[PDB]
Design an enzyme around this catalytic site. Structure first.
Site, PDB file in Angstrom:
ATOM      1  N   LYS A   3       0.839  -1.179   0.000  1.00  0.00           N
ATOM      2  CA  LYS A   3       0.000   0.000   0.000  1.00  0.00           C
ATOM      3  C   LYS A   3       0.881   1.238   0.000  1.00  0.00           C
ATOM      4  O   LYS A   3       1.785   1.383   0.860  1.00  0.00           O
ATOM      5  CB  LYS A   3      -0.923   0.009   1.215  1.00  0.00           C
TER       6      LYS A   3
ATOM      7  N   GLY B  56       0.148   8.577   0.218  1.00  0.00           N
ATOM      8  CA  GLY B  56       0.048   9.744  -0.663  1.00  0.00           C
ATOM      9  C   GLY B  56       1.366  10.483  -0.805  1.00  0.00           C
ATOM     10  O   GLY B  56       1.744  10.867  -1.907  1.00  0.00           O
TER      11      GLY B  56
ATOM     12  N   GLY C  71      -3.247  10.816  -2.586  1.00  0.00           N
ATOM     13  CA  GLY C  71      -2.210  11.827  -2.335  1.00  0.00           C
ATOM     14  C   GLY C  71      -2.777  13.230  -2.489  1.00  0.00           C
ATOM     15  O   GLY C  71      -3.966  13.457  -2.280  1.00  0.00           O
TER      16      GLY C  71
ATOM     17  N   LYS D 209      -0.238   6.912  11.867  1.00  0.00           N
ATOM     18  CA  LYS D 209       0.333   5.864  11.029  1.00  0.00           C
ATOM     19  C   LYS D 209       0.442   4.557  11.796  1.00  0.00           C
ATOM     20  O   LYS D 209       0.161   3.488  11.252  1.00  0.00           O
ATOM     21  CB  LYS D 209       1.697   6.293  10.482  1.00  0.00           C
TER      22      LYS D 209
END
Lengths: 257, 258
Positions: free
Chosen positions: A7, A10, A44, A216
């Protein structure tokens, strides 16, 4: 080997240096290893720039973007179109046989509407692995955007970490969340190779993990909790380590939850 | 052996709920009674134009054809390979059709070179590899292919959708229908010419009988028939009643014969 989903964050998609390094690493890996690879991506900055360019303000409801009928097509364009085809162009430059998909192709990831008040925001659910398995068997690198579609035909924007998680579950695949964060360092600044949910939670409170690292790490924890196997956090910065990582080595921080 | 049918879409169709509903109903109807598989190719219709208006971007022509600047290919790719493609995929899902969205570069299905330095990122289509699409067709998927492509060096290209479809038709050895908002071309006795040679069509244009901006459409069909060596149908997406008959080989519009 079982498939691996990579994965892309962005910030990775918005950096031509990251992308060149990534695709070089992809070539290098595939010259020595036959592991089935799938890429998943979101938008992104290209969505946000398009929206600003069209003077369409983004509204949020409890931290989530309202995505009305009159914006879902623009967003789909930036994300399923521009972001996806940019990746496929990088693939082509590097002679990699990639195929672009969105979540709806082969019902790879099933999507329901999250909330009527958010409009076209989708919730990912595991789907059917048949199409992607058949592409992988034929030697293609599927590159899957995080736009999906409900069973009734309504397009949906789906959180790309969650989309990737649903796809990994669908395929019985492993999962790397790749971005600019190469790994979570302890209080002495050393990369922690493997991190339980108990350490993560402790480190956040202890204040070692703060800022964007919190989100994250939480992204990875949610992904691991759902999946039932570990999820890796990694960066593109030490490109030489990517093949090892793609082989299953915890070159970043592996989250266990 | 396969003999796929490519149905090329564009223009106002891609933005009409009722038209798309009737189009997809016809697709399902044909699919129920025929094993011969379908492929959709599409351009960007009003979707590109709409986005250009909203961004206040000018659409400039040169040799007749439209310029696609380096600073605009990303936006156009979005509207075409993103919005238009996925709109069609959404209609497929509504109608229970297992579709897979592609662009020209997927499996190098249609190869693309830059047509002209002055047109920027406008691509010239040539036949590519049929392996990917053939495998999808054999597995029972309906490929839905946008007219964005990519050069071997990785530059995105906007390709004329009629010529993209023709190149794909060559690649797959496919029949080809160009659906557009067209009328019947009438003879001197006022009846629709259902079939005519590339030679005849060319002559009717030359002798002023072929009226309107149909000139561009007939020229497209004519070039396709000469390239393919097989008949190419021009037909309207209105009166979708006639579409299955059209798909089933009946000349319900205007066929340019080889």
């Amino acid at each position: 080997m079982n498939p691996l989903i990579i994965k892309l964050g962005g910030v990775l998609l918005d950096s031509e240096e990251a992308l060149e390094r990534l695709f070089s690493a992809l070539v290098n890996y595939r010259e020595s290893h036959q592991r089935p690879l799938v890429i998943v991506h979101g938008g992104g900055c290209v969505v946000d720039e398009l929206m600003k360019g069209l003077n369409l303000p983004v509204k949020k409801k409890n931290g989530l973007r309202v995505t009305p009928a009159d914006q879902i097509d623009i967003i789909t364009g930036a994300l399923a179109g521009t972001a996806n085809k940019t990746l496929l162009a990088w693939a082509k430059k590097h002679q990699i046989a990639a195929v672009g998909l969105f979540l709806g192709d082969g019902d790879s990831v099933k999507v329901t509407q999250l909330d009527e008040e958010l409009g076209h925001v989708g919730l990912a659910q595991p789907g059917s692995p048949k199409l992607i398995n058949s592409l992988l068997e034929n030697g293609y690198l599927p590159v899957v955007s995080s736009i999906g579609v409900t069973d009734e035909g309504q397009l949906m924007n789906v959180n790309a970490d969650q989309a990737a998680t649903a796809l990994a579950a669908t395929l019985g695949a492993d999962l790397i969340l790749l971005s600019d964060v190469s790994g979570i360092l302890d209080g002495k600044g050393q990369r922690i190779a493997e991190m339980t949910a108990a350490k993560a939670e402790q480190l956040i409170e202890q204040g070692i993990i703060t800022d964007g690292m919190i989100v994250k790490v939480n992204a990875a924890l949610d992904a691991a909790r759902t999946l039932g196997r570990p999820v890796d956090i990694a960066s593109w910065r030490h490109a030489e380590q990517l093949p090892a990582l793609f082989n299953g080595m915890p070159m970043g921080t592996r989250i266990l939850a």
